Design a protein around this ligand. Structure first.
Ligand SMILES: Nc1ncnc2c1ncn2[C@@H]1O[C@H](COP(=O)(O)OP(=O)(O)OP(=O)(O)O)[C@@H](O)[C@H]1O
Ligand SMILES: Nc1ncnc2c1ncn2[C@@H]1O[C@H](COP(=O)(O)OP(=O)(O)OP(=O)(O)O)[C@@H](O)[C@H]1O
Ligand SMILES: Nc1ncnc2c1ncn2[C@@H]1O[C@H](COP(=O)(O)OP(=O)(O)OP(=O)(O)O)[C@@H](O)[C@H]1O
Ligand SMILES: [Mg+2]
Ligand SMILES: [Mg+2]
Ligand SMILES: [Mg+2]
Lengths: 486, 116, 433, 259
């Protein structure tokens, strides 16, 4: 058979098609799923990434501060912890089904406190105060396809691998018809729910609908970045019909961020260290004893700057880590140390680490361009000063460049550079319609994002706009000693 | 477009050659024709309703088929079903394409009105 | 003699940067940036910290060069401590990046001592099982702006989560030309990013370019008898402020400010020399640089104008006259021919053969083909393959009307033709209205 | 270590070709562009250079026959495999299916799998992939050439076989879209009337003087070359204003008006 096209790289998973409604003859024929070694979960790739080191690492006194300010390593989230914990505990002890929607901006401690509530629930179930439950964590931004959540959750429930539609019918039949005495309670963390709802609202409506079933024994914790995601993905009738718990996560204040930072630094500040003077390795208590500190006002202004802009813990922790890294860079450069009295992280280190975030490189990039690129930007600024359109044709820029060269003939620099600009300093080269490196600087300003150019194959009538603002361009061209006097 | 013309032409060519291992439906089927099937190739293109095909596409397809002239086992014949007249056709084709088509062409009045 | 061949080969390998790592040339104005990059990699492969950092700079600003030199520096001392996964934003799509990561992981783990088997869901789950002392995984992401699209930024989210939370040491080097790269990221992605942005250092003064040329062309190993004399000839030409070499370096500094642009001209100056005296004469004169610069401009709108015939030039001038008189700059074949025929009639009244319409059609097609004319409001060459596919299935209105009625616009205006056409040409007086 | 042949008005282009194209991969650029309009002798000069250096390993692809990007990738994989097994017949290789290449990443993977089985070679070699007419591709989006510039970065640098790309393109504006990449580019400017006349004489006088109609005319009733050259200059003097500097159009007019 002669084919019209070929698909030669099809890789298909060995996933079955038959849903759970056909695994048994009747609803009364289903055994105890808790007493089954494939149900409810009743990582071999670590040794791939393993090797042996030859030389010992020199662990500098600041590397403790850097390692201990990582996001991988619950002050201020007590009402949220209490609310999620009492909703989940009350629904678990009553063998009911509930759903808690948690919203907020990134980095405010949403996933962390939901996980801490879940571990506290697991510890209480270890003391047999509440019945046992399965914990499933489903992240919408960790998927190839949004329907794979259906494949994931059922695989955590039954242990078998199905396709997503059959998994959806299996989960529907599990939460609807399977009796409560033959099943276990399930707590689902639906993180990044906006990643799974972009195409359509099937996953949102299915997961919220399963908690309305009397047989479900299902706890769904759904975490998102906007508050009106259920109100705009489902109607108000549906959201009134489910009745989810609604919890917002406001950004941290500066005092809360400060307590977070020095609770990360509780055992390290104002502490002693035995430091090897020839290598720089430090051991927490030929050897010098060095005290280490971070000042209070540095953390204070860092947490004050973060709480004004974003209020998230990740930025505050990362500027503290960057300040410690800057201090350790200067320390290692001063003492000549390698990789294999009082040491302080100062206010100026936090200032510099914040200034790398605060400042922009647009003006600095534009002041170090060539004369032709600055000529292009100056001609563009002259054109938007004259006709006031904010989009200029490229031919108008060419004519404005030609006019600026022709007018300033008495200037020493323009007289010295015009032969370069229109003949590349050579008498065998004819006078060109464009300047030398015209398309080079046009492509460079388009690649940098300074410019925007429309898609048009006529090079004269094609339009170009500044993609930054007019004031950084004015500040850049007034820095140049050539452009600012003409 | 020219891509669909070439893909349909090479699918029909490969199907007709197989009728009496998959391949790419492009002009490398033409250059590899004697390596696969062992015999020489004579393609006869019949363009139906030439007054209806977009002439830029047809010009680019003729320029595409010009690339097969460097293969010694290929000859190409073109049949144009002209409905209006020949002067209306050559005013829509580019002059280099007309110079290409001028080397050997034959006109044939195929109307039922001719001679009654 | 083999000595000049050895010296020419050494100059060519120094210009292409294909020396070994111990002999590799690093420019002074780059060195601090190199040291900063040298810090971050040394905090990942040796000290097992996790880093994410984006290098921002223009094309040919030595991002890939410095990253490759750092990796090949670390490869000769710690080869069992890290693996390298490299992705490119042009080649890898959102689907094929996962397959590329898995394939590169399985070969790089077999180069020290399956993830890539199955569907995309299974492969991505196995990758997250692998990633989300220990071997450092170093990711080199070229054109990282293409994955920071207005679409779910799934891969950047997962890579930055591997940076923050994973027990595997992970170092990401993104590379971009966009100065506002932080605005491209979604909030969750930006929050998970370390906000360590290295802007690549620019050439600030002419002595930076002079020192870089001195670094590129000085042979610092005695592998030829001509090495010392070539070095002192080089130092004499680079020390003279009025030499031809300093003039060309100043010219590049004011126009391109690009050392690779200068290397592309210096390479066939060295490679076309036949002996040592010819090479010394060529570096004294730099006449080959002028010939090179003349060749690089030979197919722009100036050199294409001088290749036209007098009938082609007459049709171009007539079309420019009609386009200048038109309100929107549009013209067609009929208006241009009418202007041309009244122009030949007014010249012959004060002899020139007037060509017919059928012959002027070929000249018109040749002027369209040489990009002197352009179809009105034509987009031209589309940005991406999807837009080109959408355009290729559309039937444009210009392709069905007869050729004499198609609207066209000039890529060169009448004033530019008056600038370029010499005074002795017989159609120069019609470049004014 | 290379031979620079004689091309009649392309001496600078041949010298640049000798300066850039070499059998040693350390002194050879990854990408080389030859830019010129139609009939400027790009194919002629490149063919003369590669036939003057038979030790250079070149693979010729014309992308006007492939139309789209996927057949171009498949043709690259197929022709690279074919050239390697007719170049090294004593190296046992697995014949990879070129139709499995449906993505640029798949081309990278397939080329890596092709090149790892030639590591038994002694010296590092060059594979010259000549994409004669890249911008003659019919679909031709802007983002395609950027995939081919950066293709060598994804392939192993210490491999025995290194792929070198030589691109031929027509339009100046297409080339000027990629000016910041600083790829070495050799320009082929359009010939003048004298150069066109000399090229037409040297390429068509031997075919005109040995034609069947002329030798039938001398029997019905150096100087044959004189009358063929005189016809060529008469055709040029009559029709240079009409054809411009087009070699092909003047060749058609010569072929039409010779009998
Ligand atoms: N209250 C807190 N106490 C201590 N550390 C915190 C706190 N809140 C956040 N952090 C730190 O900041 C990190 C970010 O928190 P988390 O992952 O819970 O944020 P999130 O609100 O879920 O963010 P996103 O929307 O980006 O996923 C945590 O991993 C932790 O290291
Ligand atoms: N691995 C390498 N070995 C030798 N020279 C190299 C290497 N990588 C790049 N170069 C050279 O370094 C110079 C700078 O180009 P490079 O590719 O490093 O810039 P870039 O900023 O990474 O570019 P782009 O943004 O276009 O990817 C060029 O002349 C290039 O040929
Ligand atoms: N320098 C030359 N010496 C002799 N003949 C030449 C020369 N240049 C061109 N020709 C002749 O003109 C023909 C056309 O040249 P060629 O095909 O190389 O041009 P091109 O620029 O590659 O064209 P295109 O853009 O159409 O592919 C050649 O096949 C050859 O017969
Ligand atoms: Mg979270
Ligand atoms: Mg790069
Ligand atoms: Mg050619």
């Amino acid at each position: 058979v002669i084919r019209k096209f070929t698909k030669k790289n099809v890789a298909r998973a060995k996933k079955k098609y038959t849903p759970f409604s056909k695994r048994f003859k009747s609803i009364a024929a289903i055994p105890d799923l808790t007493s089954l070694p494939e149900f409810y979960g009743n990582s071999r790739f670590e040794n791939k990434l393993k090797t042996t080191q030859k030389h010992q690492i020199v662990e500098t006194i600041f590397s403790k501060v850097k390692k201990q300010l990582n996001s991988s390593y619950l002050p201020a989230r007590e009402n949220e912890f209490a609310s999620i914990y009492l909703s989940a505990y009350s629904a678990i002890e009553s063998d009911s089904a509930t759903t808690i929607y948690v919203a907020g901006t990134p980095g405010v401690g949403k996933t962390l406190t939901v996980r801490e509530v879940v571990k506290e629930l697991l510890s209480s179930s270890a003391q047999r105060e509440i019945p046992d439950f399965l914990y499933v964590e489903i992240n919408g931004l960790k998927m190839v396809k949004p329907t794979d959540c259906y494949e994931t959750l059922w695989n955590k429930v039954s242990g078998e691998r199905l396709t997503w539609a059959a998994s959806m019918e299996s989960l529907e039949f599990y939460f609807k018809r399977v009796p409560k005495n033959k099943k276990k309670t399930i707590v689902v963390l639906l993180d990044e729910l906006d990643a799974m709802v972009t195409k359509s609202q099937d996953i949102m409506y299915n997961f919220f609908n399963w908690t309305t079933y009397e047989n479900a024994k299902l706890i769904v914790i759904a975490v998102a970045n906007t508050m009106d995601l259920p109100e705009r993905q489902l109607g108000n009738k549906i959201t009134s019909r489910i009745g989810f718990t609604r919890i917002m996560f406001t950004g941290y204040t500066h005092e809360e961020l400060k307590n977070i930072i020095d609770l990360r630094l509780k055992g390290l500040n104002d502490s002693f260290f035995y430091v090897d003077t020839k290598t720089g390795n430090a051991i927490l208590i030929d050897v010098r004893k060095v005290r280490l500190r971070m000042s209070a006002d540095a953390i204070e202004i860092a947490s004050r700057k973060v709480a004004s802009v974003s209020g998230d813990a990740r930025r505050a922790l990362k500027v503290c880590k960057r300040a410690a890294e800057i201090a350790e860079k200067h320390y290692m450069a001063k003492h000549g140390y390698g990789y294999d009295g009082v040491q302080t992280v100062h206010i100026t280190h936090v200032m510099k680490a914040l200034n790398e975030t605060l400042n922009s490189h647009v003006i600095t990039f534009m002041t170090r361009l060539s004369f032709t690129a600055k000529l292009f930007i100056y001609a563009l600024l002259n054109l938007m000063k004259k006709n006031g359109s904010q989009e200029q044709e490229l031919g108008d820029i060419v004519d404005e460049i030609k006019l600026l060269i022709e007018v300033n003939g008495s200037n020493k620099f323009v007289m010295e550079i015009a032969k370069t600009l229109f003949q590349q300093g050579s008498d065998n080269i004819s006078e060109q319609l464009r300047i030398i490196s015209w398309d080079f600087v046009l492509n460079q300003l388009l690649d940098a994002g300074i410019l925007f150019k429309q898609t048009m194959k006529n090079d004269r009538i094609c339009c170009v706009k500044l993609n930054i603002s007019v004031e950084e361009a004015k500040r850049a061209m007034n820095e140049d000693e050539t452009l600012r006097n003409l | 477009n020219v891509r669909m013309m070439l893909r349909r032409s090479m699918y029909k060519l490969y199907s007709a050659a197989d009728a009496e291992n998959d391949v790419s439906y492009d002009l490398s089927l033409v250059e590899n024709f004697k390596r696969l099937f062992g015999k020489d190739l004579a393609m006869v293109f019949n363009f139906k309703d030439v007054d209806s095909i977009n002439f830029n596409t047809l010009d680019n397809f003729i320029i595409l088929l010009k690339s097969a002239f460097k293969y010694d086992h290929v000859k190409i014949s073109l049949i144009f079903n002209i409905n209006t007249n020949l002067s209306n056709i050559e005013k829509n084709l580019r002059q280099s394409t007309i110079r290409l088509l001028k080397r050997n062409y034959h006109k044939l009045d195929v109307s039922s009105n001719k001679g009654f | 003699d083999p000595g000049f061949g050895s010296l020419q080969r050494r100059l060519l390998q120094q210009l292409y940067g294909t020396l070994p790592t111990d002999e590799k040339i690093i420019f002074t104005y780059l060195q601090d940036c190199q040291q900063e990059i040298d810090r971050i990699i040394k905090q990942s492969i040796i000290q097992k910290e996790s880093h994410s950092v984006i290098l921002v700079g223009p094309r040919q600003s030595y991002k890939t060069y410095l990253l490759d030199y750092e990796l090949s520096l670390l490869q000769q001392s710690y080869k069992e401590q890290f693996i390298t996964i490299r992705l490119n934003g042009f080649i890898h799509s959102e689907q094929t990046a996962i397959n590329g990561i898995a394939t590169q992981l399985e070969q790089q783990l077999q180069k020290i001592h399956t993830i890539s088997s199955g569907s995309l869901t299974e492969v991505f789950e196995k990758i997250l099982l692998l990633l989300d002392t220990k071997i450092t995984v170093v990711f080199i992401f070229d054109e990282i702006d293409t994955f920071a699209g207005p679409v779910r930024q799934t891969l950047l989210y997962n890579l930055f989560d591997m940076v923050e939370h994973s027990r595997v040491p992970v170092c990401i080097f993104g590379c971009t030309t966009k100065l506002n790269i932080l605005e491209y990221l979604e909030k969750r992605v930006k929050s998970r990013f370390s906000q360590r942005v290295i802007y690549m250092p620019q050439i600030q003064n002419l002595d930076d370019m002079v020192d870089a040329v001195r670094n590129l062309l000085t042979v610092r190993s005695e592998i030829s008898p001509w090495v010392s004399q070539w070095n002192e000839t080089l130092e004499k030409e680079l020390s003279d402020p009025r030499s031809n070499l300093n003039r060309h370096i100043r010219m590049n500094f004011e126009t391109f400010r690009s050392l690779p642009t200068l290397k592309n001209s210096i390479i066939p100056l060295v490679a076309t020399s036949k002996n040592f005296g010819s090479l010394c004469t060529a570096i004294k004169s730099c006449s080959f640089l002028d010939i090179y610069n003349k060749n690089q401009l030979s197919n722009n709108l100036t050199g294409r104008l001088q290749s036209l015939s007098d009938l082609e030039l007459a049709i171009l001038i007539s079309a420019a006259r009609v386009a200048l008189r038109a309100k929107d700059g549009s013209f067609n074949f009929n208006l241009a021919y009418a202007e041309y025929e009244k122009m030949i009639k007014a010249i012959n009244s004060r002899t020139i053969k007037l060509w017919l319409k059928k012959d002027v059609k070929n000249v018109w097609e040749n002027l369209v083909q040489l990009d002197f004319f352009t179809e009105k409001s034509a987009v031209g060459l589309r940005d991406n393959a999807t837009a080109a596919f959408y355009a290729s299935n559309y039937q444009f209105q210009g392709t069905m009307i007869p050729f004499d009625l198609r609207s066209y616009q000039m890529q060169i205006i009448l004033q530019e033709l008056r600038r370029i056409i010499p005074k002795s040409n017989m159609y120069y007086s019609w470049t004014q209205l | 270590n290379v031979t620079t042949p004689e091309v009649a008005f392309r001496e600078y282009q041949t010298n640049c070709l000798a300066s850039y194209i070499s059998a040693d991969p350390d002194i050879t650029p990854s990408n080389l562009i030859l830019q010129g309009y139609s009939g400027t002798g790009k194919t002629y000069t490149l063919k003369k250079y590669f036939n003057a250096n038979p030790n250079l390993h070149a693979v010729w692809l014309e992308p006007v026959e492939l139309v789209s990007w996927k057949p171009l990738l498949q043709a690259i994989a197929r022709t690279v495999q074919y050239k390697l097994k007719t170049l090294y017949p004593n190296i046992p290789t697995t014949d990879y299916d070129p139709l499995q290449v449906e993505e640029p990443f798949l081309l990278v993977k397939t080329l890596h799998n092709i090149f790892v089985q030639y590591e038994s070679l002694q010296e590092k070699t060059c594979l010259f992939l000549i994409l004669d007419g890249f911008d003659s591709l019919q679909d031709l989006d802007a983002a395609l050439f950027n995939k081919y510039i950066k293709l060598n970065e994804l392939l192993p640098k210490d491999s025995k076989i290194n792929i070198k790309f030589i691109y031929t393109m027509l339009e100046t504006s297409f080339l000027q879209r990629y000016s910041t990449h600083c790829i070495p580019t050799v320009m082929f400017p359009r010939y003048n009337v004298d150069e066109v006349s000399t090229i037409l004489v040297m390429s068509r006088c031997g075919e005109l003087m040995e034609d069947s109609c002329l030798r039938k005319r001398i029997i019905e009733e150096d100087q044959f070359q004189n009358v063929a050259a005189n016809f060529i200059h008469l055709i040029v003097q009559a029709f240079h204003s009409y054809t411009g500097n087009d070699i092909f159009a003047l060749n058609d007019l010569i072929d039409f008006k010779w009998p």
